[PDB]
Design a binder for these strands. Structure first.
Length: 128
RNA sequence: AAAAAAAAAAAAAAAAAACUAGAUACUAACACAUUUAAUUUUUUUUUGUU
């Protein structure tokens, strides 16, 4: 609802196409921060809503090291960037499970401690 | 220009109020297009990763 507020102003001026859009600030980014998730949605189900706008190559759900349950945020890289422009813009502010999730562009830095979680995820997304 | 008179009835201290609706004049240099670049409507069960 912070970002959703911008695009309405922006589109109203007829900004139309990325060169003039703030989404142009990125261009080298693909992962999207996915916020305000519900707690029970897992990686496979976050890999439900987000293929509407593209083809995910990677995904990471943030979850406590001990109890292993959702922190409530994820980082999902689309194969073709412009999905990111599409997901951030279009699906931000949308309700799942009563709470409206947030998306925004992100630069994502991998953490050693999850290293196995990368192949464990990749192998599934490597199936396709 | 100009040269009077005379025969014992009256007097007066100068319409409202209320009700309900309608009719028309009028009063305040009243206000009538700019208003928006520091500052509080922005609210949620804390939860954005070398």
């Amino acid at each position: 609802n912070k970002i959703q507020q911008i695009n309405d102003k922006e589109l109203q001026s007829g900004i139309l196409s990325p060169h003039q859009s703030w989404h142009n600030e990125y261009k080298d980014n693909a992962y999207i921060y996915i916020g305000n998730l519900n707690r029970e949605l897992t990686e496979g189900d976050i890999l439900t809503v987000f293929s509407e706008y593209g083809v995910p190559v990677d995904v990471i759900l943030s979850r406590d090291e001990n109890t292993g349950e959702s922190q409530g945020f994820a980082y999902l890289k689309y194969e073709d960037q412009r999905s990111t422009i599409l997901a951030v813009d279009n699906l931000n502010g949308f309700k799942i499970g009563g709470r409206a999730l947030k998306i925004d562009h992100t630069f994502y830095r991998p953490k050693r401690s999850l290293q196995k979680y990368y192949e464990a995820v990749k192998e599934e997304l490597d199936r396709d």
